[PDB]
Amino acid sequence: KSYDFDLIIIGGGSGGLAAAKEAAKFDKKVMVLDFVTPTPLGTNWGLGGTCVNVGCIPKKLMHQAALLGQALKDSRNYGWKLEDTVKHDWEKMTESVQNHIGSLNWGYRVALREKKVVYENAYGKFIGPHKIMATNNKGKEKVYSAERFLIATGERPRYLGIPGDKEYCISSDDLFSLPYCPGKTLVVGASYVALECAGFLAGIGLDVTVMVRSILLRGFDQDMANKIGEHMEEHGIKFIRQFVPTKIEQIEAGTPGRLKVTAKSTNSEETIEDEFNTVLLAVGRDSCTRTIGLETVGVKINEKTGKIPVTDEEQTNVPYIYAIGDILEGKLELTPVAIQAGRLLAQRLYGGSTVKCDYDNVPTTVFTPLEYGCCGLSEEKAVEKFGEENIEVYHSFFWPLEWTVPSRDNNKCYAKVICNLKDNERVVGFHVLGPNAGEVTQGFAAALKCGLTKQQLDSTIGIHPVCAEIFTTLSVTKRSGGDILQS
Amino acid sequence: SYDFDLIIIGGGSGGLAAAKEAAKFDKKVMVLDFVTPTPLGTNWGLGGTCVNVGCIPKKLMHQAALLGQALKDSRNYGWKLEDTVKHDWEKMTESVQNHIGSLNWGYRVALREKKVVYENAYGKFIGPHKIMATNNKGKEKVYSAERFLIATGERPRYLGIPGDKEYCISSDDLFSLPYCPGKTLVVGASYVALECAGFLAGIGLDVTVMVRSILLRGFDQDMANKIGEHMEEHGIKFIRQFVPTKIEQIEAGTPGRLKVTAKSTNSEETIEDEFNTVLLAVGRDSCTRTIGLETVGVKINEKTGKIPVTDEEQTNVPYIYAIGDILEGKLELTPVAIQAGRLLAQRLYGGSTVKCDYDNVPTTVFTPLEYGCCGLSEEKAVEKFGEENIEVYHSFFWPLEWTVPSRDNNKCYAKVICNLKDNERVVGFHVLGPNAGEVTQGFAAALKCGLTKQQLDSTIGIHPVCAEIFTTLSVTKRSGGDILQSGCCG
Numbered sequence: 001k002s003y004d005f006d007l008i009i010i011g012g013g014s015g016g017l018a019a020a021k022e023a024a025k026f027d028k029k030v031m032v033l034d035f036v037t038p039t040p041l042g043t044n045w046g047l048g049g050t051c052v053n054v055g056c057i058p059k060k061l062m063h064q065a066a067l068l069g070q071a072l073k074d075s076r077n078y079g080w081k082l083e084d085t086v087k088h089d090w091e092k093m094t095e096s097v098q099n100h101i102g103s104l105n106w107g108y109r110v111a112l113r114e115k116k117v118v119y120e121n122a123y124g125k126f127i128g129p130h131k132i133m134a135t136n137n138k139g140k141e142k143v144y145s146a147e148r149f150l151i152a153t154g155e156r157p158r159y160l161g162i163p164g165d166k167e168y169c170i171s172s173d174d175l176f177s178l179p180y181c182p183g184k185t186l187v188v189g190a191s192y193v194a195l196e197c198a199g200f201l202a203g204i205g206l207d208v209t210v211m212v213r214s215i216l217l218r219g220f221d222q223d224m225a226n227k228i229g230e231h232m233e234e235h236g237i238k239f240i241r242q243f244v245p246t247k248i249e250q251i252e253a254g255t256p257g258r259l260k261v262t263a264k265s266t267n268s269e270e271t272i273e274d275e276f277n278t279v280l281l282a283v284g285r286d287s288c289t290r291t292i293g294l295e296t297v298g299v300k301i302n303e304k305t306g307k308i309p310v311t312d313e314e315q316t317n318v319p320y321i322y323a324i325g326d327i328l329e330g331k332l333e334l335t336p337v338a339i340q341a342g343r344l345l346a347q348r349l350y351g352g353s354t355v356k357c358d359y360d361n362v363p364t365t366v367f368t369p370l371e372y373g374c375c376g377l378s379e380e381k382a383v384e385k386f387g388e389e390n391i392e393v394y395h396s397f398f399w400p401l402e403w404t405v406p407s408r409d410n411n412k413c414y415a416k417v418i419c420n421l422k423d424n425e426r427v428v429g430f431h432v433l434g435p436n437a438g439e440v441t442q443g444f445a446a447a448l449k450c451g452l453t454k455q456q457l458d459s460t461i462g463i464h465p466v467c468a469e470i471f472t473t474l475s476v477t478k479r480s481g482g483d484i485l486q487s
Numbered sequence: 488s489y490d491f492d493l494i495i496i497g498g499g500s501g502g503l504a505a506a507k508e509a510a511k512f513d514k515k516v517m518v519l520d521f522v523t524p525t526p527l528g529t530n531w532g533l534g535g536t537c538v539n540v541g542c543i544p545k546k547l548m549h550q551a552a553l554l555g556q557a558l559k560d561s562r563n564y565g566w567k568l569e570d571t572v573k574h575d576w577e578k579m580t581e582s583v584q585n586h587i588g589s590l591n592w593g594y595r596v597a598l599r600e601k602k603v604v605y606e607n608a609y610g611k612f613i614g615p616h617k618i619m620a621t622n623n624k625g626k627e628k629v630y631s632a633e634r635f636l637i638a639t640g641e642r643p644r645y646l647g648i649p650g651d652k653e654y655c656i657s658s659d660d661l662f663s664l665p666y667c668p669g670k671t672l673v674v675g676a677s678y679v680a681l682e683c684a685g686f687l688a689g690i691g692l693d694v695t696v697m698v699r700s701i702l703l704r705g706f707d708q709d710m711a712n713k714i715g716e717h718m719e720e721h722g723i724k725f726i727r728q729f730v731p732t733k734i735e736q737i738e739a740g741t742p743g744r745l746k747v748t749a750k751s752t753n754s755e756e757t758i759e760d761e762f763n764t765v766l767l768a769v770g771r772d773s774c775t776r777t778i779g780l781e782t783v784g785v786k787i788n789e790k791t792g793k794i795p796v797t798d799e800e801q802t803n804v805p806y807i808y809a810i811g812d813i814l815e816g817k818l819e820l821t822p823v824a825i826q827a828g829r830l831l832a833q834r835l836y837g838g839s840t841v842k843c844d845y846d847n848v849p850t851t852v853f854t855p856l857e858y859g860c861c862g863l864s865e866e867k868a869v870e871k872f873g874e875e876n877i878e879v880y881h882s883f884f885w886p887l888e889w890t891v892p893s894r895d896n897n898k899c900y901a902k903v904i905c906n907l908k909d910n911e912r913v914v915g916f917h918v919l920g921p922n923a924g925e926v927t928q929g930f931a932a933a934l935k936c937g938l939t940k941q942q943l944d945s946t947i948g949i950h951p952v953c954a955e956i957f958t959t960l961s962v963t964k965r966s967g968g969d970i971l972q973s974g975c976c977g
């Protein structure tokens with residue numbers, strides 16, 4: 001049983017690098033292949049995976065650029081004397097973003113080098129049992145053998161079958177390196193990427209429009225979703241409901257060129273949406289499992305949504321082949337989750353541990369202009385599982401102290417917690433719609449890991465004055481409640 | 488056949504809380520509230536310390552400072568600002584005050600709608616079940632009540648030294664200052680001192696902090712020193728181990744000129760170059776001395792005027808209860824006061840047996856670099872559980888928001904203290920970084936659930952968010968590695 005490597009990691013992303021780093025602690029020959037196939041417009045990036053180069057990192061960063069804008073406005077009533085209007089510079093921003101990314105790109109490379117992990121910038125493709133072919137960037141092929149493999153190739157944006165889409169639209173992959181300011185833009189899609197992007201685009205000052213197929217943030221508590229929606233609409237994001245692009249043609253070429261988008265809905269009507277400068281097409285992602293030669297090793301995969309089914313230990317049907325991250329069928333598409341998986345995977349293989357990755361109740365927060373953090377079940381999802389009769393939903397609005405001097409957005413920040421009456425009112429849902437939502441939510445997610453109950457929650461005391469405290473005093477229930485408007 | 492079934496002496500955090508609840512059970516309630524002026528004569532409205540001269544103001548100015556840092560940050564994110572943006576104290580405090588008034592009135596209005604009698608008068612017991620309310624012009628009125636709740640809270644303390652009351656100010660005064668404080672010296676080193684020192688500086692002033700001994704006495708000392716080093720790195724000067732002995736006025740004026748002189752533990756003296764404003768907050772004393780306590784028989788620690796109390800907030804005199812800062816051995820925290828207050832009323836007229844849990848109440852200090860914490864201090868844990876039994880996991884972290892501006896890497900800090908003898912139960916929680924409070928709160932809940940280290944680890948983090956490092960604390964102090972690691976690891 002002698003191969004070139006104990007473990008080959010296909011994909012240098014969130015999960016891939018994690019597995020690598022850990023695997024490395026136990027003196028094992030490991031190599032990670034990572035390669036970034038270009039977007040149709042030809043955009044590329046470095047080691048690090050989606051989060052690092054065209055996902056969370058960029059997104060939060062720009063999100064922050066937008067927040068900072070609102071901060072400039074806020075500063076006036078706090079005594080800072082600013083100029084009625086500060087202009088934004090796309091160029092400069094992206095530069096700083098990328099600058100950082102590069103630092104991360106290198107960092108990782110260095111990290112792998114120090115941990116004695118072979119890194120090869122090449123496309124991995126299985127060719128047969130225990131054997132994989134790495135295609136160089138110049139086309140040079142090289143074959144490698146390994147006792148075990150970890151498929152960590154993540155996924156890429158998906159386009160609409162419609163004409164012109166690939167040729168003149170962009171996706172998140174391209175957004176974060178756009179060499180020019182996007183200009184008036186249309187964003188097609190309504191889940192977190194679409195909303196978040198649409199959000200910060202607007203926050204930085206652009207004319208933004210979101211075209212939704214159906215409902216927003218499908219998957220998440222629909223009420224919270226709609227609150228996010230209304231807020232975006234109230235802060236200059238235009239929405240076109242129930243429509244889907246049918247064709248996108250180029251009226252004029254140019255950096256911010258001019259595109260003509262047309263769409264049809266469930267209504268048979270059609271609209272030639274006034275042209276836009278850029279069309280943000282993030283509307284889904286497809287797992288990169290199609291062209292990595294899985295047939296040659298016998299790995300089974302959901303042929304419809306290329307996701308890979310897997311044991312609770314991340315093992316595929318093929319004993320020596322494991323997978324991690326987004327690719328996983330049924331799991332969540334989240335960096336932390338991928339890094340944990342990866343991490344603990346190595347721990348089990350080479351570290352003799354029995355801990356598996358718990359994918360229940362993992363926090364998450366979507367960075368819309370008005371952030372949204374949540375952990376656990378969504379209200380409707382709770383009534384389904386536990387029965388309307390047995391759910392009690394405590395909620396309230398709140399007003400961040402920070403917003404008063406500015407005098408804005410009262411009664412918008414919202415918080416609710418859903419409890420299971422048949423279980424000590426165990427809090428099985430947590431939702432907050434306010435500033436720093438993530439920082440607020442993290443803590444409570446831990447609490448959910450300890451079976452936090454409503455009485456315990458109440459028994460905790462709040463930190464004042466700080467947004468997260470309304471959770472320490474949720475007294476009004478939806479079931480009866482009446483007003484939770486501002487006392 | 489008493490006048491009211493409950494009278495509440497104090498329109499503060501706790502007081503108003505009790506009123507509001509009590510009021511739900513249809514009982515005749517009256518809350519007296521009166522604000523004795525500061526020596527410089529400043530006053531304020533209904534609402535208590537937190538509202539008029541504590542948390543509210545404090546945070547708001549703290550926010551004024553953070554926005555300053557925010558303007559600076561915006562440049563590398565693409566906003567084109569001017570190298571220097573000036574700050575206007577006047578405008579800021581107007582805004583702050585404005586808000587406060589909004590609170591002042593809100594409370595009055597609430598009391599009126601809840602049907603609670605509100606009388607702006609100073610309360611003083613005269614005899615069993617009887618209290619004398621001295622109005623503002625000196626008119627007296629007496630009231631009778633079946634029960635009383637003493638919620639007077641405390642007030643700033645001055646140093647015995649000369650000139651202190653005549654030329655210095657305290658937090659009481661700070662948040663209404665009619666003029667920019669100018670170069671100021673802040674005497675004292677606990678939360679109030681450092682917080683105010685902090686935002687003063689962040690707003691652009693020359694600030695110095697004079698410490699008698701250690702900083703943040705009472706808090707996990709290492710965290711405290713970090714806070715300090717941070718303040719020092721961001722232009723707050725500190726004088727260690729000194730105490731003012733006299734403050735003389737070199738020149739009157741709105742920002743006038745004072746000459747401060749101090750002595751240490753070392754017999755040496757320094758005539759600290761004058762300053763424009765000397766912020767003297769340095770402790771607080773319970774207002775329990777001049778309220779007619781002897782006439783009803785309430786016992787109180789004569790040394791620290793705090794009121795000893797049962798686990799139900801009852802004093803030694805069965806119909807008299809106390810709440811808030813005044814409580815002996817409790818925490819001087821608004822939310823705590825309001826919980827107590829609320830729960831109290833719940834017990835009295837709501838037939839409940841829930842009592843307020845003063846264990847592991849989270850807190851955060853709003854210094855320029857915020858510090859949140861809950862549970863025991865590292866040192867406090869070893870004392871309790873024994874060095875041998877404590878494992879402390881910690882790490883540095885770099886808020887994504889800080890990279891683009893490129894500043895303060897390896898400065899935010901996070902540690903968790905566990906009890907090896909109890910499945911590494913997390914008994915301590917400390918975070919030094921932005922948004923500390925919002926980070927801490929959640930965990931404080933966890934603590935109430937007996938959060939264990941393995942549970943913690945089992946929790947998945949939200950990325951990219953400061954809070955997440957807690958979801959991956961792997962390096963222990965005892966095995967000391969470097970927790971210095973920019974960039975990347977996994």
Ligand SMILES: Cc1cc2nc3c(=O)[nH]c(=O)nc-3n(C[C@H](O)[C@H](O)[C@H](O)COP(=O)(O)OP(=O)(O)OC[C@H]3O[C@@H](n4cnc5c(N)ncnc54)[C@H](O)[C@@H]3O)c2cc1C
Pocket residue numbers: 010011012013014015016033034035036037048049050051052054055056057059122123124125152153154155172193288291292324325326327333334335336338949950951
């Ligand atoms: C816009 C956006 C915002 C996001 N925001 C958040 C967030 O805010 N918080 C959060 O938790 N998550 C966020 N995510 C999702 C999260 O970043 C991903 O879930 C995570 O990176 C998945 O990690 P992974 O390792 O499985 O996949 P990846 O991290 O993408 O790893 C895949 C890597 O392998 C490479 N690869 C693919 N095929 C091959 C092959 N054939 N040969 C060699 N290499 C290959 C890819 O180029 C890539 O480097 C965001 C995602 C996006 C798109």
Ligand SMILES: Cc1cc2nc3c(=O)[nH]c(=O)nc-3n(C[C@H](O)[C@H](O)[C@H](O)COP(=O)(O)OP(=O)(O)OC[C@H]3O[C@@H](n4cnc5c(N)ncnc54)[C@H](O)[C@@H]3O)c2cc1C
Pocket residue numbers: 463464465496497498499500501502519520521522523534535536537540541542545608609610611638639640641658679774777778810811812813819820821822824
């Ligand atoms: C500068 C500063 C900053 C602070 N920051 C925070 C913070 O960020 N977070 C936090 O949680 N806590 C903070 N606190 C602590 C908090 O303010 C106190 O815990 C809280 O006010 C306690 O309120 P209380 O109800 O016990 O008494 P208070 O709220 O202080 O109210 C006492 C009230 O009773 C009135 N009164 C007293 N005697 C009489 C009498 N004889 N007759 C009529 N009325 C009377 C007083 O005038 C006052 O209205 C801060 C405190 C200070 C000083």
